[PDB]
Design a protein around this ligand. Structure first.
Ligand code: HEM
Ligand SMILES: O=C(Nc1ccc(N2CCN(c3ccc(Cl)c(Cl)c3)CC2)cc1)O[C@@H](Cn1ccnc1)c1ccc(Cl)cc1Cl
Length: 449
């Protein structure tokens, strides 16, 4: 009949911004241990933030519709990235239509080309950059490059990959991004209008035009039929809203930007932790096992190699998303009271559910710091690496496709060694949390027989 515990505020303007910004894992865990309650409230600049940290309760969070627990507020910190009236910014009917359109373009029906195209770009990058028999590279850095490469390769039509290349596009992603403020999500009054924030404007507007140009190009080759180009951009342009309308350039640009920005960091980070773990000595058996699964593949890989025939490798990826969820927190705007366990949660609060917290609940994941791909969430619905319910991640299959593919190519044609005693500390100081960049230096030993 009343709110969840609160956590003592010793410095009233801050709330818990500092110990939360410092080590959110430790902290949230502390709240959950001390408050004797897996569900509890914290404050951020005096904004109530109720963390649903008991896995049995996940349903409570992910189930209510947008109108009760609203995404839109919590994501406004993106409207410059996506645009006005794009995604959440858009009314929920439309946002759903837009996300749907995207989702179609990312079903497995589209993936038929991808595994080969991905393998290609990876071998490319590796030969152009892992030229020597040995050498030391930054695994987080490179991967980031492989990912943006392999993604465009997959979702980007020849002509568009011409006028825009992966490397250049990434600079639009950085550019667009750098102008973001995490804090904004709790305190958007910050949002009110801030110097490079133009950039994200510039970064976007530049991109948009590029596409607006790209389109005119492909329309004037239809009489010929010169190319039957069905890349992500293609699909998006063919889509029709119910009301019989289509996506304006701005919405199309939005939805692709979203798509790629989405994949970029989450995917490179997951790739990074997975390789890291495997390449550790303690995980030899896990490496040994991986091999017994990719050794009897043809060099050229197809689909049936990847999804259907790499269950273990997929275990590694997921387990790695389990241990170090790139996205720490899923959040909504409580627009009306909601039951969560034996607590209620007041209209106006911020409700969150934390992959980071939940993946370290001891009931659900004994020894949560231990990376064990063979482990299984004791507690059904515990793992939320990809969210759940309505807004669960559509990019899910595609990302698994990339990482696994890359994992395969990489460890097949190379060996590896961590230049550190232990796998990198997470770096919780990025909006999308990865392994610590200046700790990701690795030594790649080419292979031969
Ligand atoms: C490791 C890779 C990935 C992780 C860890 C990840 C994580 C997540 C999470 C936790 C959510 C739910 C967050 C929320 O409630 O809003 C989500 C949703 C989403 N993800 Fe991903 N994701 C990944 C890959 C991708 C990729 C590759 C794309 C794009 C191709 C993508 C696009 C999205 C989109 C568009 C949503 C919105 C879901 C919706 O409301 O329908 N994700 N993802
Ligand atoms: O969720 C995001 N972005 C996002 C927003 C906010 C944060 N943070 C974290 C740090 N914060 C913070 C922390 C600590 C302290 Cl102390 C303080 Cl103050 C502040 C503030 C809030 C982080 C990320 O969008 C992605 C998700 N995605 C990616 C792949 N699959 C899904 C996405 C979703 C849907 C669509 Cl359509 C496109 C895209 Cl790109």
């Amino acid at each position: 009949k009343k709110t969840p515990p609160v956590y003592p505020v010793t410095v009233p303007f801050l709330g818990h911004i500092v110990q939360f910004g410092k080590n959110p894992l430790e902290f949230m865990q502390r709240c959950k241990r001390d408050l004797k309650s897996g569900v509890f409230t914290i404050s951020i600049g005096g904004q109530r933030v109720t963390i649903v940290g008991d896995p049995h309760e996940h349903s409570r969070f992910f189930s209510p519709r947008n109108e009760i627990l609203s995404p839109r507020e919590v994501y406004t910190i993106m409207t410059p990235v996506f645009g006005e009236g794009v995604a959440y910014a858009a009314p929920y009917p439309r946002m759903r239509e837009q996300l749907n359109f995207l989702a179609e373009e990312l079903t497995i029906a589209k993936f038929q080309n991808f595994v080969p195209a991905i393998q290609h770009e990876v071998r490319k990058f590796m030969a152009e950059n892992w030229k020597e028999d040995e050498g030391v590279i930054n695994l987080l850095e490179d991967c980031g490059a492989m990912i943006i490469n392999t993604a465009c390769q997959c979702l980007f039509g020849e002509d568009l990959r011409k006028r825009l290349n992966a490397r250049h596009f990434a600079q639009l992603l950085s550019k667009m991004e750098s102008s973001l403020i995490p804090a904004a999500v709790f305190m958007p009054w910050l949002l009110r209008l801030l110097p490079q924030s133009a950039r994200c404007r510039e970064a976007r507007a530049e991109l948009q035009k590029i596409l607006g140009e790209i389109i005119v190009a492909r329309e004037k080759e239809e009489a010929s039929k010169d190319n039957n180009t069905s890349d992500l951009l293609g699909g998006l342009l063919k889509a029709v809203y119910r009301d019989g309308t289509r996506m304006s350039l701005h919405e199309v640009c939005g939805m692709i930007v979203a798509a790629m920005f989405a994949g970029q960091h989450t995917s490179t980070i997951t790739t990074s932790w997975s390789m890291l773990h495997l390449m550790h000595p303690k995980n030899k058996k896990w490496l040994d096992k991986l091999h017994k699964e990719i050794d009897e593949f043809p060099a050229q890989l197809n689909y049936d190699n990847v999804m259907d025939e790499m269950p273990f490798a997929e275990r590694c990826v997921r387990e790695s998303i389990r241990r170090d969820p790139p996205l720490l927190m899923v959040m909504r705007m409580v627009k009306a009271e909601v039951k969560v366990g034996s607590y209620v949660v007041p209209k106006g609060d911020i409700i969150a559910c934390s992959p980071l917290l939940s993946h370290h609940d001891e009931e659900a994941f004994p020894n949560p710091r231990l990376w064990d791909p063979e482990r299984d969430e004791k507690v059904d619905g515990a793992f939320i690496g990809f969210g759940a319910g309505v807004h669960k991640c559509i990019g899910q299959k595609f990302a698994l496709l990339q990482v696994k593919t890359i994992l395969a190519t990489a460890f097949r044609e190379y060996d590896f060694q961590l230049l550190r005693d232990e796998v990198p500390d997470p770096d919780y100081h990025t909006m999308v949390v990865g392994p610590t960049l200046n700790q990701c230096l690795v030594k790649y030993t080419r292979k031969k027989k």
